[PDB]
Design a protein around this ligand. Sequence first.
Ligand SMILES: Cc1ncc(COP(=O)(O)O)c(CNOC[C@@H]2CCNC2)c1O
Ligand SMILES: Cc1ncc(COP(=O)(O)O)c(CNOC[C@@H]2CCNC2)c1O
Lengths: 405, 405
Amino acid sequence: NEEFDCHFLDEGFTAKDILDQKINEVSSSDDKDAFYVADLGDILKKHLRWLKALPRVTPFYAVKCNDSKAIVKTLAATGTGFDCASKTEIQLVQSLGVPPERIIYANPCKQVSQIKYAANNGVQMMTFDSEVELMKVARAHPKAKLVLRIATDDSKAVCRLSVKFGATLRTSRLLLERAKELNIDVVGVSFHVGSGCTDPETFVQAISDARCVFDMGAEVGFSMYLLDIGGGFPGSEDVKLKFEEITGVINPALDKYFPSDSGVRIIAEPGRYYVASAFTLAVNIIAKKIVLKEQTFMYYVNDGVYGSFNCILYDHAHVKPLLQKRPKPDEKYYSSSIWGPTCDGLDRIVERCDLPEMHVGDWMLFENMGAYTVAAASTFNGFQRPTIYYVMSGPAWQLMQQFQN
Amino acid sequence: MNNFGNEEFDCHFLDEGFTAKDILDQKINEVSSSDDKDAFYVADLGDILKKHLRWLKALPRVTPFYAVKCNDSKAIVKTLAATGTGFDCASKTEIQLVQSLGVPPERIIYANPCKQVSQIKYAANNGVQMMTFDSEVELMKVARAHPKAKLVLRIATDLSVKFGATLRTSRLLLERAKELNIDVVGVSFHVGSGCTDPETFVQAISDARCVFDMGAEVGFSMYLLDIGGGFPGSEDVKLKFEEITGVINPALDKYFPSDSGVRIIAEPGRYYVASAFTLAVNIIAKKIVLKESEQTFMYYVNDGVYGSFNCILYDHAHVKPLLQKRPKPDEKYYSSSIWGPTCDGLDRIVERCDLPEMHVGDWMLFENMGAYTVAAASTFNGFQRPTIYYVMSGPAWQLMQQFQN
Ligand SMILES: Cc1ncc(COP(=O)(O)O)c(CNOC[C@@H]2CCNC2)c1O
Ligand SMILES: Cc1ncc(COP(=O)(O)O)c(CNOC[C@@H]2CCNC2)c1O
């Protein structure tokens, strides 16, 4: 099918050039639906970069970030783990041939029937942060390996008084004693610093806290070996806090609190890092209005906040439109807004930006659209999700085969 | 109650003396001793038939065209088509859905002011003649891909930011349409969903009259007046349907008398379906928080802001959780929050409310969940859309048959 359909990327060509080619090919066809170009070679590059930056940390891809079957198949061929939050994601991962020991059910609040499904399919490792979860596990998957998820405080997060997941150290101690009472095996500690991390020092704090809980486990009789540092790493270079800074702050903390001789196994749950920059979205300007204030423009394109751009609300992502052909400096720029296809007035992509005068049929490009865009899109107003074209060069395929070897 | 075959076309009998609430009670009791407690809807089509009867009684001069985007369930569209209402379609997929159920094109209005060219072409190919517009570029596109269309000018009202032409712009649009030999047959407006002041309608109607007169000056024979939607779909509102209709009908008689030959239609979306759907979610997780001991609770249920409750973010909807059994007056209440199945922290249905202490396996009910809830739901994190159980009483079926004749 199209999902499993992969196109060759010839030598000297990038995803950008492929985008330009397809756009030129449909110049006078009049079928100008929005579409993605997904470079799996970018995912292989990200994996190489991860192996180089965090050699002690095994990556478990957060499927909920992008559940595309091609992505999961490529990552499974690469040999990464997978973080699954629901029965459907476990089904997806196992359907591609991944054994259960490469799957972590890292949802702290799981429905009982889904816990039973995880037990039925041999997924042993699950996270938890509450006593009711311990009761449910004892009653539905008693031989599970539990990872205690501890809380982290993020200043940039809107809500800090109420945190959905994560136990405090005080609560963690009681959770460990309760797990010992119920004869449930606790094997490690997990945390999630959050995508909007501004200061890498936070990770260190979390790591320190994790060590503390590890010691607590040693006091209660548990053999703790699994440390899960979660996700939140950036997926593109268009950020102030870059991946390598975070890793350079993390590695000394890991060496200090969890030395290799201790026998600890360190993992992570990066979602956006692997896929963010792999996808580039092309939308077509389907409508245009001119408002006199000085000329300003309202452009309507064929994707919106109910589709790929739901990240504007759910993830609060900031999107900047890109022109296919670069404009000369002398050309005048105008104040413009960009709107979605749906009738709702709340379907606005960009409130105000500077753009040259464009016309219906012109294309706009959005880079770094791999993370939390298609995974949360809906078909409101009947508009279908854009076709995704997967590309991969021969050298990239060779690297993937080497990983299999 | 269990669906057999296809859920979309499966309808269950509602016995005499039974309401949707009783069906909810029965379904909840049926799964009392099992762990498959997925969230589900009960949809009373008889409530939709009641809404249609109420509309016919309140707005005898206004033909309703159901806004398919509010709820695209095939059962809903089938019932309304059997009832003989029109349909407002915003995209190619909605036209496909409506025509697949046997609705002729003259009962379809393409009320999307900014349509992609290929979708205009599709509408032309399938005989849908009537389309809305509010811009000159739209006139160019129509003259190119649908020359014999009947255009309805959408005017601004005090959604207005995204759509709606001013009277000044309306004059130029009518003259430009005359230049391009495009037939303009009427005027449409949308006062907005959940309008606080009914007087707006009067103003809008007045404005419509003006544009009608403009058409008479340029040579158009204007006959179609479209007053849009925005009518409430439940009694749980300050401004009730009958007040709005009591304000609308005199304005229609004053500005568009029946002897003038005008044909008046509307595009009610939420009015027909809002109260017809009741949602049942199961409490899948529970946390107890101590305030320094004042006990507060966090309940995690199996639907969230990525699912049915996306209306909180998109539709500005306030949800009221309801208990299956009415609580005792002396029963103690606690401060509580309600959270979704997904790992995302922002997936919170209710920040704070007063509820008695509940336990995993208990059910919560949400009424008036028919409008803009399932139509914009996604499968983020792999969580599946709730099963919908359609019910209909015998007398409701008799009323539907009377409408069909
Ligand atoms: C438990 C857990 N592990 C990993 C991730 C992935 O985070 P990343 O930033 O690496 O993609 C998550 C996801 N956390 O938040 C996802 C939010 C949903 C919309 N965008 C942010 C979790 O929870
Ligand atoms: C053009 C048009 N006609 C009808 C409707 C339906 O409005 P109603 O309030 O009767 O359901 C609409 C609605 N448009 O957007 C609805 C937004 C989506 C989420 N809540 C607001 C339009 O546009």
